[PDB]
Write a protein that binds this ligand. Sequence first.
Ligand SMILES: CC(C)=CCSP(=O)(O)OP(=O)(O)O
Ligand SMILES: [Mg+2]
Length: 297
Amino acid sequence: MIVNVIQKDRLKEQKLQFIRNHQQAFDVEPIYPLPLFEDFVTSIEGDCSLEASCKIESDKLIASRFLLFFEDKTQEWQKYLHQSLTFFGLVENRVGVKINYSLLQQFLGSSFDFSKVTVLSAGIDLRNNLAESSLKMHIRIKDYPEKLDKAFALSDGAADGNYLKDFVNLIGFDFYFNGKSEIEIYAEVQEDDFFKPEINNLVWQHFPKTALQPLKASSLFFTGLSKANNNPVLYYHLKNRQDLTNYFKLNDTAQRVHSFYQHQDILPYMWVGTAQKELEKTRIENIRLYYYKSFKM
Ligand SMILES: CC(C)=CCSP(=O)(O)OP(=O)(O)O
Ligand SMILES: [Mg+2]
């Protein structure tokens, strides 16, 4: 029991430390209402991971981006969903806003089978312009064609975007403080399938050659299907964070983030998000960089 109490206190502080290291590097003052998210992550006592992210738009650095992944081995997905939604409710109460839950409600709608969930996340992207701040949730489903269809119906709709339907497992939800909400579906290719002839035919053929180069350093590739008809956002799961500069042509602002994280006590892998057109450039101007740390008993 004494072991358990010490570990719990330690995990609480390590989570706050990871959040504070990120915030203090990039924002002299924390963006309101970050402490609410801090309270949320410290309330999650089972195993989890945290994500800290920067979104770069030329010289603009957006850095109050944090996400928790529920990783407790018991996989009580409905409980974590309820914990996340209660946190969303506290944000609503404190800030004085009403969140638009309709897309999530419709997704869950008809008798949701939580045994089909494999990933659940909850987090924030906070801005000084309240209306542009958002809450975030991702749900990964496995062997659930009914809910894949539903997510597709909820997003943009018919072909194309439909051309990568059979590759979708992750669904994302954004909930803006102004009452606007969005859904996104993500097509994926895992490492073991990169060189399969059908994958070149179904996937790689429809992307420029520059899009294919970071796959050498990646274990996973995602693309967002509903937003931006041309110029989709491409996501790369780099096995080693050190490989970023070898595969992506970073501007000054993104270099600063990369430099900060090179020698932080974080997980070796990262995610990199960038629009297709950016990889065709001599220099990336718009990029998302995601860093991770695990918190286990
Ligand atoms: C799914 C991956 C790899 C990253 C999160 S993409 P998102 O749409 O949830 O977040 P942002 O658009 O980067 O704020
Ligand atoms: Mg997004």
